[PDB]
Design a binder for this molecule. Structure first.
Ligand SMILES: *[C@@H]1O[C@H](CO)[C@@H](O[C@@H]2O[C@H](CO)[C@@H](O[C@@H]3O[C@H](CO[C@@H]4O[C@H](CO)[C@@H](O)[C@H](O)[C@@H]4O)[C@@H](O)[C@H](O[C@H]4O[C@H](CO)[C@@H](O)[C@H](O)[C@@H]4O)[C@@H]3O)[C@H](O)[C@H]2NC(C)=O)[C@H](O)[C@H]1NC(C)=O
Ligand code: RET
Ligand code: BOG
Ligand code: BOG
Ligand code: PLM
Ligand code: PLM
Length: 326
């Protein structure tokens, strides 16, 4: 018997020596050394110092440069807003709790932090799904006499917030729950404890199918097609060096986007899967931190990939940072 249970928590450490405490009430220095808690705090400090400016710039530069305010770009603004929910709801809270060594804000703060952080990563997740749908439509043109505009972009944004509420809301009201994870300083969905009163088993199956498998299939299909169309069109135009280079660029970027999506979400999905099919196994606190490390760090690498590497935004940002010149 692997940990210690409580009304709203599961500490991943045995209480045979009697030292375990509520992660809402006292430090967890028997799970991990104080310096490891400090390193958690350092890592959140890094993600704030990099994630805040990068995502805030994205919004600010868009306010200063008319060329960026196209409808295809609305979902990338949405991505930056989501990243900021993670920065201000998640990372700042965890910086604070890590340096106490436990979730000092108690079970209500655990629901708050877990909600805003989960909502953030989920809006981001679906933003990358919708962007792939939007680009597939625009390029592969699978419905004739259709022109992607403002209206559709608004719907895409609204859809991400609905899908994210469908993940983040139910654990506030009975289906799964928010409890402290890993080192017990951040809160997330209880995806690893069988907890029949809240129906954790069904919620994890729903999450895995609807919020991981569906996303992954939609992304592979949409970008799979997009690459096919672009490569077919370029083979029909080998006289153009331009078209050939654009085809190489599009293909490389699609590979990077798809790999980035897997890096971000496969660890949560794989760990959840392994735990679901190996219910007689202990999982320690550092191990349970790894999925979060991969997901949370996307609040930096997603805007680098989707925004910073796009040359329109990059010019405007330099201009904005250099007070109006270049
Ligand atoms: C992990 O495992 C530990 C050990 O089992 C648990 O910690 C114990 O929790 C219990 C309560 O569930 C604690 O018992 C209470 O002690 C209170 C404090 O006073 C004690 O004073 C004596 C000196 O007289 C000291 O030697 C003790 O160490 C205590 O400090 C006391 O207020 C209280 O008594 C009241 O309730 C009991 C009923 O439970 C009645 O007997 C009594 O009439 C009165 O109403 C308890 O006796 C115990 O002290 C804790 N032990 C330690 C080592 O911390 C953790 O809770 C477990 N963790 C999790 C997360 O579940
Ligand atoms: C800081 C922690 C965050 C932002 C964690 C968010 C976690 C998710 C949205 C994870 C969802 C998943 C499961 C709970 C299991 C099935 C696979 C996922 C990725 C959909
Ligand atoms: C940038 C934000 C800084 C966060 C300030 C963290 C304050 C930590 O608070 C400390 O927590 C200990 C628990 O291990 C307590 O014993 C002490 O009372 C307290 O000094
Ligand atoms: C779901 C997204 C999958 C993208 C499929 C990538 C197709 C790999 O195809 C490769 O693309 C390279 C870049 O032009 C070429 O240099 C290789 O010769 C070509 O086979
Ligand atoms: C508009 O063009 C404004 C550009 C900024 C001009 C000032 C340049 C100062 C560069 C020094 C950066 C060091 C900051 C580190 C502080 C710890
Ligand atoms: C255009 O003319 C303006 C360019 C000036 C930018 C100066 C470069 C600043 C780099 C700062 C990194 C410091 C990290 C620590 C922050 C507290």
């Amino acid at each position: 018997m692997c940990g210690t249970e409580g009304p709203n928590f599961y500490v991943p450490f045995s209480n045979k020596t009697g030292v375990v405490r509520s992660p809402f009430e006292a430090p967890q220095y028997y799970l991990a050394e104080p310096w490891q808690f400090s390193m958690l705090a350092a890592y959140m400090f890094l993600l704030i110092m990099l994630g805040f400016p990068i995502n805030f710039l994205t919004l600010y530069v868009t306010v200063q440069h008319k060329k960026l305010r196209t409808p295809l770009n609305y979902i990338l603004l949405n991505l930056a807003v989501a990243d900021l929910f993670m920065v201000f709801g998640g990372f700042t809270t965890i910086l604070y709790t890590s340096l106490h060594g436990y979730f000092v804000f108690g079970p209500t703060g655990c629901n708050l932090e877990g909600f805003f952080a989960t909502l953030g990563g989920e809006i981001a997740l679906w933003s990358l799904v919708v962007l792939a749908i939007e680009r597939y439509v625009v390029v592969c043109k699978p419905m004739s006499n259709f022109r992607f505009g403002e209206n559709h972009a608004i719907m895409g944004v609204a859809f991400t917030w609905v899908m994210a509420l469908a993940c983040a809301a139910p654990p506030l009201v009975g289906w799964s729950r928010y409890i402290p994870e890993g080192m017990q300083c951040s809160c997330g969905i209880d995806y690893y404890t069988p907890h029949e009163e809240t129906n954790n088993e069904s919620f994890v199956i729903y999450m895995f199918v609807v919020h991981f498998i569906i996303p992954l299939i939609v992304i592979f299909f949409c970008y799979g097609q997009l690459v096919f169309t672009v490569k077919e069109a370029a083979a029909q135009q080998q006289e153009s060096a331009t078209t050939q280079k654009a085809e190489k660029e599009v293909t490389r970027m699609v590979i990077i986007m798809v790999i980035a999506f897997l890096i971000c979400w496969l660890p949560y999905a794989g760990v959840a899967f392994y735990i679901f099919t190996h219910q007689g196994s202990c999982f320690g606190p550092i191990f349970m931190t790894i999925p979060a490390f991969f997901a949370k760090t996307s609040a930096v690498y997603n805007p680098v990939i989707y925004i910073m590497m796009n040359k329109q935004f990059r010019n405007c940002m330099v201009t904005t940072l250099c007070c109006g010149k270049n």
